């Protein structure tokens, strides 16, 4: 019987988690970029480490890291239903305990607050979308080629290309 | 996840906590009879030398007159079941709360009677050690049930396999 | 290979758990009462189930399996014989 | 690979199908357009089914006997998108037919009497509602399970 604007703790959290991981992902590229250096999916096996052991399959490195990742991840689902994180930085974020205004249900637009400091992460929000939908682009453009820019005496024009196969 | 948090009384509680679980507890040492054939491996550089009745090279004496059907396995077996079946019977029948008869007049008041005839009496630490046992037979023992021909002659470099299998 | 008399041994494990009560206490089948003529009336239609009567025999007649099963099956059973057999008897071992 | 014989790369029986049939539809020795500007067996209808060719794509594609293709759709080898690829597609499209079915509907019953709005249709296709459907991420897939249509509405 209750009309609108339900959502709550809800999935404001989901997006922001997308923004924060999108930003990190982009950093995972980032890397070559000035010394053109290394490229693309790479499928790397990541940084290395330096060799005595491997040849390297060496087991499933991910499967393991990821079992651990997995009870950090629960910790967060927990918090979100009923909350405890000492910093308390997504759920509201810091400046913490309030967000009371969300906690008892029903806000409808609300902007929000955070940190003992100030400048309300509305500036992290942006730096954060761009990185959302930046993967979007980045992932899209593979299918074809690695690299962007720098110079024209020839490069900018996009004089001849592949298409999609049909 | 048999439990997250289901629930309510006398059977889950009653049959289920107390006893499934005391009967699982009777289990770990008894698991231990089994783990035990195994510990018997289990220390290196111990001096077994050589019996222990493994692999069927022929007779228990042989016996005078024939050996019974063929082998040990059935004798030990038939016999074990009737003896033990008798003991599962000794577990069977008290009650807790009090036991005078097939007595007719003890329902509950408030509060609040008798706890599972045995409830734990504390030294529910036995349980940390206990769950831990249920978990290990499960899982780990299984961790090598599956393709299990070989004893170690351990190589290098690391560990695990993944697919497979 | 196949322990055939592994299990016929086995099934007259249980139906000697049948040789039971015909003998002992009382007249037999504990009556009839109900069967011909029929029930009160009853009329759910109806009774009698007790979860409690597993006691009595399970300990007494645990033996019965053995009696053929043991020494009588793979026995040369009822070796201790002879006892009027002109027309003929034996019955000589198939073992 | 799985029983029906294998793809394009060889399916003789399939080859024989390419050939007779179409190639004969050809085999009207001529029928005459020596210039002539109209009659189009000649060009494509064959060639559009014909410049089907040791290529088709490639597509794997199983070709039973008589070399007509059979579709396994297992999650294997080549064949995955002969059901799922065009499967989730069917799902996504439908459901955004009826997500808006449960929409240019749950928007009326209301105000001053609404007894047959439905047979004329302000705005058509709802439209407004319409795009809700692509702008479902998740959409019903959690909201149907919680709140709105909610067990109580159940
Ligand atoms: C597995 C593990 C578990 C149990 C969860 C569980 C959850 N994740 Mg999650 N996640 C994981 C690994 C896991 N995640 C990994 C490796 C990544 C990368 C993410 C990226 C991610 C995002 C972006 C979001 C979630 C969200 C969620 C919640 C819905 C739920 C509690 C959402 C809330 C949403 O924000 N996850
Ligand atoms: C004091 C606690 C510490 C804290 C801060 C939390 C906090 C949380 N736990 Mg948790 N947990 C803890 C110890 C803790 N746990 C321990 C020691 C265990 C051992 C079993 C668990 C087992 C557990 C499970 C299985 C789950 C949680 C879940 C949760 C989250 C949802 C709240 C809830 O389900 O309570 C329960 C609310 C009650 C009112 C308890 C009812 C009491 C009985 C008698 C009824 C929340 C973040 C849930 C979750 O986040 O799922 C994704 C759920 O998964 N916990
Ligand atoms: C009490 C009840 C009763 C009357 C008995 C009685 C007996 N138990 Mg026993 N037992 C019980 C509960 C009981 N047990 C429980 C809860 C466990 C667990 C065990 C685990 C256990 C083992 C391993 C053994 C017995 C044995 C025995 C017999 C000596 C005796 C007949 C022994 C036969 C054998 O040593 N019990
Ligand atoms: C019965 C039980 C008992 C009391 C023992 C006892 C022993 N085992 Mg043993 N074992 C058992 C079951 C048992 N085992 C089973 C089920 C297997 C399989 C093994 C495989 C095994 C091996 C390979 C070895 C022993 C060895 C040993 C001895 C050290 C010790 C006498 C060692 C001699 C040798 O290491 N056992
Ligand atoms: C056969 C014999 C007989 C007559 C019984 C009879 C019974 N068992 Mg039992 N049991 C047996 C062999 C037998 N068990 C063996 C070989 C194992 C191992 C178990 C492990 C076991 C467990 C864990 C439990 C029982 C339980 C029970 C009782 C329910 C019932 C009296 C329950 C009591 C339950 O606690 N048994
Ligand atoms: C069959 C055995 C017998 C044995 C070997 C034990 C042994 C033990 N009992 Mg115990 N107990 C028994 C019969 C027995 N009890 C009986 C019949 C009762 C009721 C009459 C109790 C009621 C009892 C209580 C209340 C406690 C113990 C506790 C203890 C532990 C303290 C040991 C210690 O001082 O070192 C260190 C110990 C291992 C104590 C404990 O804290 O463990 C749960 C305490 O709780 N017992
Ligand atoms: C019945 C109890 C007995 C007692 C008196 C203690 C007492 C203690 N244990 Mg402990 N423990 C026990 C049995 C016991 N344990 C058993 C059977 C296990 C089996 C795994 C453990 C596993 C364990 C661990 C891993 C740790 C402790 C820790 C501790 C200490 C602090 C707990 C804490 O605040 O951090 C941890 C808080 C928790 C809620 C962890 C759960 C501990 C208990 C309640 C359950 C055991 C773990 C559980 C099965 C899941 C993992 C404390 C001295 C901590 C410590 O550093 O001391 C060595 C921690 O490292 N214990
Ligand atoms: C029964 C199962 C399940 C559970 C509960 C565990 C639990 C555990 N495994 Mg494990 N494991 C499992 C299935 C499981 N595993 C499977 C199927 C495999 C593949 C065969 C492994 C391969 C594996 C490896 C290689 C390791 C573990 C390790 C561990 C321990 C982590 C280190 C630690 O405990 O810190 C404090 C104690 C932990 C007790 C670590 C270990 O045991 O040290 C050698 C080790 O990294 N596991
Ligand atoms: C996560 C899921 C997705 C889903 C929903 C299914 C669902 C199914 N798969 Mg499957 N499969 C998948 C991914 C998936 N598969 C992938 C990535 C592979 C590559 C290894 C396979 C390889 C595979 C095989 C070989 C088979 C299935 C089969 C099946 C069916 C049993 C079932 C319909 C089986 C089947 O449908 O036939 C008996 C069987 O053929 N799958
Ligand atoms: C993988 C695979 C598979 C599997 C399957 C199965 C296992 C089945 C089942 C399934 C199922 C189990 C189903 C059911 C479910 C339940 C439910 C319950 C559902 C629901 C829903 C609804 C309710 C909907 C609604 C809607 C929408 C969403 C749209 C619009 C609106 C409407 C209303 C229409 C198959 C086979 C396919 C084949 C192969 C592949």
Give the closest residue to D83 by CA, choosing from D97, D94, D72, D93.
D72
Contact status, residue A18 vs residue A133, Cβ threshold 8 Å: no
C36 burial via Cβ count (<10 Å: 0-12, 13-18, 19+): exposed
Chains in contact with C via at least 3 Cβ–Cβ pairs below 8 Å: B
Give the start-to-end residue ranges of the domains of chain A: 1-166
Domain that holds residue D153: 1-154
Q: What angle do CA D42, D47, D48 make, to 5 degrees?
A: 120
Tell me if chain C has a CB within 8 Å of the CB of B69.
yes
In the Cβ-directed half-sphere of D79, how many Cα atoms lie within 13 Å?
Answer: 17
Q: What is the DSSP letter of B138?
A: I
Q: Cα–Cα distance between A129 and A140 in angstroms, integer?
A: 17
Name the CA dihedral angle for C82, C88, C92, C94, rounded to a multiple of 10 degrees.
-140
Q: Cα–Cα distance between A8 and D45 in angstroms, integer?
A: 60
What contacts A80, CB < 8 A, 6 or more positions away? A9, A13, A91
Q: Cα–Cα distance between D78 and D1 in angstroms, integer?
A: 9
Q: What is the DSSP letter of D147?
A: S
Q: Cα–Cα distance between B154 and D42 in angstroms, integer?
A: 73
Across the interface, whether the CB atoms of A53 and B161 are under 8 A apart is answered no
The residue whose CB lies within 8 Å of the most ligand 9 atoms, and thus the one to mutate among D75, D78, D91, is: D75
Contact status, residue A113 vs residue A120, Cβ threshold 8 Å: yes
Q: Which residue has the tokens 């294997």?
A: D76
| Experimental approach taken | X-ray
A52-86 in b/e burial notation, b at 16+ Cβ within 10 A? eeeeeeeeeeeeeeeeeeeeeeeeeeebbeeeebe
Q: Cα–Cα distance between B129 and B32 in angstroms, integer?
A: 13
Contact status, residue A149 vs residue A155, Cβ threshold 8 Å: yes
- What token pair was written down for A51? 């060799």
Q: Cα–Cα distance between B150 and B127 in angstroms, integer?
A: 33
Q: Cα–Cα distance between A16 and A127 in angstroms, integer?
A: 11
Please list the alpha-helical segments (H only) found in chain A. 9-28, 61-81, 100-103, 123-131, 134-141
The residue whose CB lies within 8 Å of the most ligand 3 atoms, and thus the one to mutate among B36, B90, B99, B118, is: B90
Helices B21-40 and B126-136: crossing angle, nearest 10°?
60
Q: Which residue has the tokens 């039973």?
A: D64
CATH number of the domain within which D125 lies? 1.10.8.110
B131 burial via Cβ count (<10 Å: 0-12, 13-18, 19+): exposed
CA of A73 to the centre of ligand 1 (A): 7
Closest ligand 6 atom, CA of B120?
Answer: 43
When divided into structural domains, chain D yields a total of 1
- Count of beta carbons in the 10 Å neighbourhood of residue C64: 19
Q: Cα–Cα distance between A19 and A124 in angstroms, integer?
A: 9
CATH architecture of C1-95: Orthogonal Bundle (1.10)
Q: What is the DSSP letter of B16?
A: I
Phi, psi of D129 (to 5 degrees): -65, -30
Contacts of C62 in chain B (CB under 8 A): 82
CA of A11 to the centre of ligand 2 (A): 21
Query: In chain A, what are the helix, strand and coil shares in percent, each to the nearest 5?
Result: 40, 0, 60
B137-164 in b/e burial notation, b at 16+ Cβ within 10 A? eeeeeeeeeeeeeeeeeeeeeeeeeeee
């Amino acid at each position: 019987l209750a009309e609108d604007p339900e959502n709550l703790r809800w999935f404001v959290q989901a997006e922001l988690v997308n923004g924060r991981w999108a930003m990190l992902g982009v950093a995972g590229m980032l890397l070559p970029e000035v010394f053109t250096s290394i490229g693309i999916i790479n499928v790397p096996k990541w940084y290395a480490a330096g060799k005595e052991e491997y040849f390297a399959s060496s087991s499933t490195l991910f499967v393991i890291e990821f079992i651990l990742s997995h009870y950090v991840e629960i910790r967060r689902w927990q918090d979100i239903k009923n909350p405890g994180s000492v910093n308390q930085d997504p759920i509201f974020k810091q400046y913490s305990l309030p967000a009371g205004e969300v906690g008892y249900p029903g806000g409808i637009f609300n902007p929000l607050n955070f940190a003992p400091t100030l400048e309300a992460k509305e500036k992290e929000i942006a730096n954060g979308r761009l990185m959302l939908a930046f993967l979007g682009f980045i992932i899209q453009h593979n299918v074809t080629g690695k690299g962007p820019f720098d110079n024209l005496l020839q490069h900018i024009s996009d004089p001849w290309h592949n298409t999609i196969v049909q | 996840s048999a439990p997250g948090d289901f629930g309510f009384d006398p059977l889950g509680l009653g049959e289920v906590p107390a006893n499934l679980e005391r009967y699982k507890e009777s289990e770990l040492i008894h698991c231990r009879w089994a783990m035990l054939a195994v510990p018997g491996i289990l220390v290196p550089e111990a001096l077994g030398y050589g019996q222990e009745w493994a692999a069927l090279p022929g007779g228990q004496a042989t016996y005078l007159g024939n050996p019974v059907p063929w082998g040990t396995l059935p004798t030990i077996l038939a016999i074990e079941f009737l003896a033990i079946a008798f003991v599962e019977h000794q577990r069977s029948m008290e009650k807790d709360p009090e036991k005078k008869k097939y007595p007719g007049g003890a329902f509950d008041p408030l509060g609040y009677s008798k706890d599972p005839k045995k409830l734990e009496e504390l030294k529910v630490k036995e349980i940390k050690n206990g769950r831990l046992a249920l978990l290990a037979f499960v899982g780990f023992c299984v961790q090598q049930s599956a393709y299990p021909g070989t004893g170690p002659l351990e190589n290098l470099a690391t560990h695990l396999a993944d697919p497979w299998h | 290979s196949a322990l055939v008399i592994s299990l016929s041994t086995g099934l007259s494990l249980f139906l000697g758990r049948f040789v039971f009560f015909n003998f002992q206490r009382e007249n037999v089948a504990k009556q009839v009462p109900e069967q011909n003529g029929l029930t009160h009336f009853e009329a759910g239609d109806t009774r009698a189930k007790e979860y409690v009567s597993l006691l009595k025999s399970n300990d007494p007649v645990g033996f019965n399996i053995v009696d053929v099963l043991a020494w009588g099956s793979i026995g040369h059973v009822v070796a201790y014989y002879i006892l009027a057999t002109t027309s003929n008897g034996y019955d000589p071992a198939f073992f | 690979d799985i029983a029906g014989l294998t793809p394009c790369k060889e399916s003789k029986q399939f080859a024989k199908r390419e050939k007779q049939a179409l190639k004969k539809l050809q085999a009207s020795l001529k029928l005459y357009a020596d210039d002539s500007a109209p009659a189009l067996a000649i060009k494509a209808t064959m060639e559009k089914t014909k410049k089907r060719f040791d290529n088709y794509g490639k597509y794997g594609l199983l070709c039973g006997s008589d070399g007509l293709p059979h579709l396994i759709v297992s999650g294997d080898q080549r064949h995955w998108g002969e059901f799922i690829t065009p499967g989730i597609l069917f799902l996504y499209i439908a459901g955004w037919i009826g997500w808006v079915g449960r929409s240019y509907l749950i928007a009326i019953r209301d105000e001053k009497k609404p007894t047959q709005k439905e047979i004329i249709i302000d705005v058509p296709l709802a439209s407004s509602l319409l795009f809700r459907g692509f702008s479902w991420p998740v959409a019903a897939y959690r909201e149907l399970l919680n709140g709105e249509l909610v067990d109580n509405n159940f």
